[PDB]
Design a protein around this nucleic acid. Structure first.
Ligand code: ATP
Ligand code: MG
Ligand code: MG
Ligand code: MG
Ligand code: MG
Ligand code: MG
Ligand code: MG
Ligand code: MG
Ligand code: MG
Ligand code: MG
Ligand code: MG
Ligand code: MG
Ligand code: MG
Ligand code: MG
Ligand code: MG
Ligand code: MG
Ligand code: MG
Lengths: 136, 50, 76, 116, 177, 236, 66
RNA sequence: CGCGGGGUUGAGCAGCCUGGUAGCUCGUCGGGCUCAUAACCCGAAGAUCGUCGGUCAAAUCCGGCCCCCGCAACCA
RNA sequence: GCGUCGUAGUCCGGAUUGGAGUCUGCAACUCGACUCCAUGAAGUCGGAAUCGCUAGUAAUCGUGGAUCAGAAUGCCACGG
RNA sequence: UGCCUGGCGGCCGUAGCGCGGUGGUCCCACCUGACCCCAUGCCGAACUCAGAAGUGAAACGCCGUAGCGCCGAUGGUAGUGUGGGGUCUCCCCAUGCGAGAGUAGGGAACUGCCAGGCA
RNA sequence: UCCUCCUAAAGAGUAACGGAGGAGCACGAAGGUUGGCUAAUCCUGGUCGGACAUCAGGAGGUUAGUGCAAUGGCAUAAGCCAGCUUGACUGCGAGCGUGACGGCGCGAGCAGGUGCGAAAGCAGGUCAUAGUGAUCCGGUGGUUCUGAAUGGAAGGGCCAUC
């Protein structure tokens, strides 16, 4: 489910999601799933979009997951007033900004790779694209 | 607060005293130090008292 | 809730910046540890406060083998 | 190491003296000789010096490098400083324990008119 | 003393020829000898330390220092400050005398003696050897101290290698293997 | 430790300091599991007997043979050896958290607390103490050698009756041997199995049994006399 | 040293069972007589003495006197 | 999850009191008494003190979690 | 009758082991008896409870015999 | 002035680590002895005192060498003060400032006052 | 109520029933000085000794330590050991910082006496920041300052203190 072990602090601030991404190049695999849009991307969406890639190739290739949630997102319970502290931690999300490479894969043909990435991008809430390794 | 207040009387015969604290459990002995006496303007030995 | 207490601000920081013409005994910088060190014609109180020892302009320098910030006072 | 542990042995006195701006009388005590010189408060300009290596002192001593050699150099530098004008000095231990021929060099110069 | 002169005469002319040294001082030499008696289980009472100190005062011509614990470890239930061992360092004349009365009177008295495992070096020519018994030396006549305290001896030499130290120690005819 | 059937035998004991002699023509043998109450007038050799028995004096005749399986623990009259400058823990334990009593080992805090000295009380200075606690700490300090031969020289000096009954109980399940000097006839009546009564002209009577039948032996060899005191005065 | 802190260091002349009398300084106060010394070294005899292993079929041939 | 309490052998309970020391009754096992079984007598065995952890040192002190048991959920 | 050991796990205790052997037997490993050297374990008189014995008996010491090539601390008899 | 060595500084890795060869006139370190003032929670290991038979082995100090450490542009990017505009949880335009990381590369320090050799 | 960190937008300051922790002491040495010393962790060898006890030498370069939370600091050590002592002094104080005020803090230097050091010098408590309670009313010791006709006293006042 990709939830960190032994975190220093339990609750974090809201923060802001600004700027452009850093891991914008395919490094290990030959085909990557670059994100174009911006937003936050939870742990279950990572899991649900990995069981779809794994079924498409279904025996072969290495699947690299570059993003990791490591960010607590709280919420107040139902029918409670404002104040009286901060809400309990429920799920963990990974902040995504344009240019970030989310998933990447090696060992499969380009056309079958494109099929697995299209199935992967129907579970993700941001506009993502398909990118291939280069030589710099 | 286990330390109790004690006063260092002046042995020079005048009425003058400092005031400090002392753990009467760990140190049941009687303190004595050479301090200053403004009344006489000399260094005299001060011994503790209630 | 369980938390929700703080402590009053202590108002540290440099008081006389670079180039100030200070008087004798005037406080130059309040600090907790020893961020700046005491150079020529300055002292250091028990609070690590740096105070002018003689009147004159302040000068900040990074002299030393460990690259430490020093505060000194010119005789101007 | 000997010398490295010696510079650190006498750095606080070397630094306190500089902060006071006092002329210092440094002492170097090798097993074969002993040296002494006086430096300006800044530390760059050195005014006078005397040592057992110097021939005018080594001429009279059978063995340079003992107490009777220290008394020679101590008196020699004191007679050299007082002719110039330096009468206010601060003794610089420089790391060597102030017991042996380091001391005799101090006492001889002190007795020879140096005010410290 | 006698062993020091033995060195100065017929160990220098041996080792300089053996290793083709280019200078006199390049020959290795012994600098110090250390005797350790880690009394260990003495947290119970101090008599185990007093008697061990007397033991080291007997074997060695000095008085032993008491070395205490450095780190509090609960695996052996000891905490920092506890006195745990007795140690004697010997340099010079007393080192030579102890060496003489070790390799002459002491070391052949070992029960089931077969010699010293010459492999047991620490890679710098320093040699370490336990004794497992206290009765080897004539300074104490058996039925005086209850326990049989085994101790450890360490010869420290100035060899930059290990075969140099081995050759030095074989020049004095050690019971090597 | 396990104690054999030859505990202590003295034969033809004789002692004197100058002209006046304390003990002469004294002999006995002590069996296993015995408590020996020693009684007599003040200054009659009772403590000198213990000094002889544990390597401190020399008889005029000799032959005080102990057993080969005897370990001796002694407790004397005066609490003077220990210094009035240490806490109870530092004094009894010697600063060690583990205390090997004879064979086994016990924590020092627990061992000292078995004598009614709790965690708070284990910080009190010895000079800043009472008489009864002084005696209790004396006993706890000198009874840690774990030897099965107790030589107690008036251990009931300044102990309340509750601690007295505690000692009376604790002296009966102890499997070794004990020799107690005491002027407390009521204390010794409970625990005494053998008697060492001193008399005039250096007579040291040895009798087997408790005071109850010692009185019957006296009434068998009866002598009746009641003119005990003189009761004169101090001043005119 | 430290001025009467250590036990006395006296020059005894100990002896062996075959002689080997030599001058060594030790904290004994009395020159003891003991067993062999390095002069009577079991360094050229003791090694083969310790060996007490080997030989079973030769034992059979001794039992096979028939 | 708003507030409290508790978790000690196979069962029921002490000891959590301000830190160094695991206890009672029943139950189990092995002998004895009896024609045999109960009852009774003697001897012995056992618990990582809920769990993840956080003082030389804790079952006790502190927190995370699990379970169970109570209480409160009022004025419109 | 004479000595020694002087109350100690011992000059008590003879278990269990390592070697060397002798016999009967076609054959001694599982699985015999005994001998020699060394090794020297529990054990310091025994909880609840329980057994025999009235006289040459109880207690203690030794000898013999049936089975049997070899193999009794058992069984059956005899005396002090 | 050349040349090397010692003491006190300036400036703090472009100056510090590592690899190799080097020097014993003088100076430097080990060195020899320690009874003596002096010291070892044991020891001339260290700190001291007497000296000088050897040695440059160790340790210093010299150079040579790009395995490190270290310094490091130009250009671009991120951010951002003021003024405007968008589909405005984010951006864009005019103007002013302008990183960080990284690349090219530079890289075995320079030096100022005294005493002592040698020439 | 007090202390430390973040929110706090690179001077100071800045709220919430915002996010995480501590205090209501200790020390007669755990203070002052004069000497002296430098940690964690790992590797190899070495009696009972082991994953880890003491010893020996190599790497390591403060990942160590501080009387107790956090932050800043500390090699000239503020960390560790020893000797001698009481400056954990009296009267003052140029000049500053911080508060609406009550108040709180820092401070060279002057006068009297003192400790350490051969001296230069250092010392008006502790590496710093928490360890705390105005006034009234009383208690204790000193002080001719006043003392209701005068001489005393009572009671006040002043200093130290509960
Ligand atoms: N060293 C000695 N020199 C001289 N006289 C001695 C010495 N030791 C003991 N004595 C004498 O012997 C006696 C010692 O006292 P002892 O031990 O007999 O005490 P006690 O009176 O029997 O008992 P308690 O201790 O109950 O008073 C005294 O009479 C004393 O004078
Ligand atoms: Mg026998
Ligand atoms: Mg036999
Ligand atoms: Mg037994
Ligand atoms: Mg027996
Ligand atoms: Mg009948
Ligand atoms: Mg029979
Ligand atoms: Mg027959
Ligand atoms: Mg048969
Ligand atoms: Mg700010
Ligand atoms: Mg505001
Ligand atoms: Mg401190
Ligand atoms: Mg210092
Ligand atoms: Mg300090
Ligand atoms: Mg502090
Ligand atoms: Mg009047
Ligand atoms: Mg009044």
């Amino acid at each position: 489910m990709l939830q960190p072990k032994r975190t220093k602090f339990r609750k974090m601030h809201k923060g802001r999601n600004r700027g452009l991404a850093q891991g914008t190049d395919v490094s290990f695999g030959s085909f990557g799933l670059k994100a174009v849009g911006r937003g936050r991307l939870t742990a279950r969406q990572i899991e649900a979009a990995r069981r779809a890639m794994t079924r498409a190739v279904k025996r072969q290739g290495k699947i690299w997951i570059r993003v990791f949630p490591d960010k607590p997102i709280t919420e107040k319970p139902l029918a409670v007033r404002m104040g009286k502290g901060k809400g309990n931690v429920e799920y963990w999300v990974a902040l995504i900004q344009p240019g970030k490479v989310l998933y990447e894969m090696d060992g499969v043909p380009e056309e079958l790779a494109r099929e697995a990435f299209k199935l992967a991008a129907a579970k993700l809430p941001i506009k993502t694209t398909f990118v291939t390794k280069t030589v710099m | 607060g286990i330390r109790e207040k004690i006063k260092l009387v002046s042995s020079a015969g005048t009425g003058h005293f400092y005031t400090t604290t002392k753990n009467k459990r760990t140190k049941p002995e009687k303190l004595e130090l050479k301090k200053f006496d403004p009344v006489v303007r000399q260094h005299v030995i001060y011994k503790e008292a209630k | 809730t369980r938390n929700g207490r703080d402590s009053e601000a202590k108002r540290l920081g440099v008081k006389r910046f670079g180039g100030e013409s200070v008087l004798a005994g005037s406080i130059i910088v309040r600090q907790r540890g020893t961020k700046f060190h005491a150079g020529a014609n300055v002292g250091c109180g028990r609070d690590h406060t740096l105070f002018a020892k003689a009147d004159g302009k302040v000068k900040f320098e990074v002299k030393g083998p460990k690259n430490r910030k020093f505060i000194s006072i010119e005789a101007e | 190491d000997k010398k490295s542990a010696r510079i650190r042995r006498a750095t606080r006195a070397r630094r306190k003296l500089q902060e006071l701006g006092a002329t210092r009388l440094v002492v170097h005590r090798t097993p074969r000789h002993i040296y002494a010189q006086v430096i300006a408060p800044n530390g760059s300009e050195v005014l006078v010096a005397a040592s057992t290596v110097e021939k005018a002192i080594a001429e009279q001593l059978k063995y340079t490098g003992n107490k009777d050699a220290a008394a020679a150099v101590g008196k020699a530098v004191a007679e050299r400083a007082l002719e110039k004008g330096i009468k206010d000095v601060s003794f610089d231990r420089s790391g060597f324990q102030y017991h042996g021929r380091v001391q005799a060099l101090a006492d001889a110069a002190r007795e020879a008119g140096l005010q410290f | 003393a006698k062993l020091h002169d033995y060195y100065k005469d017929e160990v220098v002319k041996k080792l300089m020829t053996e290793f083709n040294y280019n200078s006199v001082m390049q020959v290795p030499r012994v600098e110090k000898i250390t005797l350790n008696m880690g009394v260990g289980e003495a947290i119970a009472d101090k008599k185990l330390l007093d008697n061990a100190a007397a033991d080291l005062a007997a074997i060695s011509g000095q008085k032993p220092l008491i070395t205490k614990a450095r780190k509090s470890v609960a695996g052996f239930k000891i905490r920092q400050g506890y006195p745990i061992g007795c140690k004697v360092t010997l340099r010079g004349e007393r080192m030579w005398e102890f060496f003489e009365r070790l390799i002459t009177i002491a070391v052949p008295r070992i029960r089931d003696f077969r010699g010293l495992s010459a492999k047991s070096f620490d890679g710098r020519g320093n040699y370490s050897m336990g004794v497992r018994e206290q009765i080897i030396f004539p300074e104490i006549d058996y039925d005086k101290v209850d326990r049989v305290r085994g101790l450890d001896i360490t010869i420290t030499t100035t060899a930059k290698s290990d075969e140099e130290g081995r050759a030095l120690l074989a020049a004095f005819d050690f019971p090597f293997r | 430790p396990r104690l054999g059937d030859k505990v202590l035998e003295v034969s033809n004991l004789r002692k004197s300091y100058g002209d006046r002699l304390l003990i002469d023509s004294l002999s006995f043998s002590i069996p296993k599991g015995a408590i020996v109450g020693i009684i007599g007038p003040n200054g009659a050799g009772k403590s000198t007997l213990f000094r002889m028995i544990s390597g401190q004096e020399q008889p005029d005749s000799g032959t005080i043979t102990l057993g080969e399986t005897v370990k001796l623990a002694s407790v004397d009259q005066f609490r003077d050896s220990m210094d009035n400058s240490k806490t109870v823990w530092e004094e009894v334990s010697g600063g060690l958290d583990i205390m090997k009593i004879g064979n086994t080992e016990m924590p020092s805090r627990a061992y000292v607390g078995r004598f009614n000295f709790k965690g708070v009380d284990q910080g009190k200075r010895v000079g800043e103490l009472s008489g009864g606690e002084r005696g209790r700490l004396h006993l706890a300090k000198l009874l840690q050698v774990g030897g099965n031969m107790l030589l107690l020289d008036q251990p009931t000096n300044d102990l309340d009756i509750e601690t007295l009954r505690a000692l009376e109980n604790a002296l009966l399940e102890f499997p070794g041997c004990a020799m107690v000097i005491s002027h407390d006839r009521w204390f010794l009546d409970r625990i005494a199995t053998h008697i060492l009564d001193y008399q005039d002209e250096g007579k040291v009577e040895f009798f087997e049994g408790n005071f109850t039948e010692y009185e019957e032996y006296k009434k068998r060899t009866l002598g009746a006399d009641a003119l005990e005191p003189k009761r004169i005065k101090y001043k005119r | 040293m430290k001025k009467d802190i250590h036990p006395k260091y006296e020059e005894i002349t100990a002896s062996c069972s075959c002689g080997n009398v030599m001058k060594i300084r030790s904290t004994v106060g009395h020159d003891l007589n003991l067993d062999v010394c390095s002069k009577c070294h079991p360094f050229f005899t003791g090694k083969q003495r310790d060996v007490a292993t080997g030989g079973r079929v030769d034992r059979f041939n001794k039992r096979f006197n028939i």
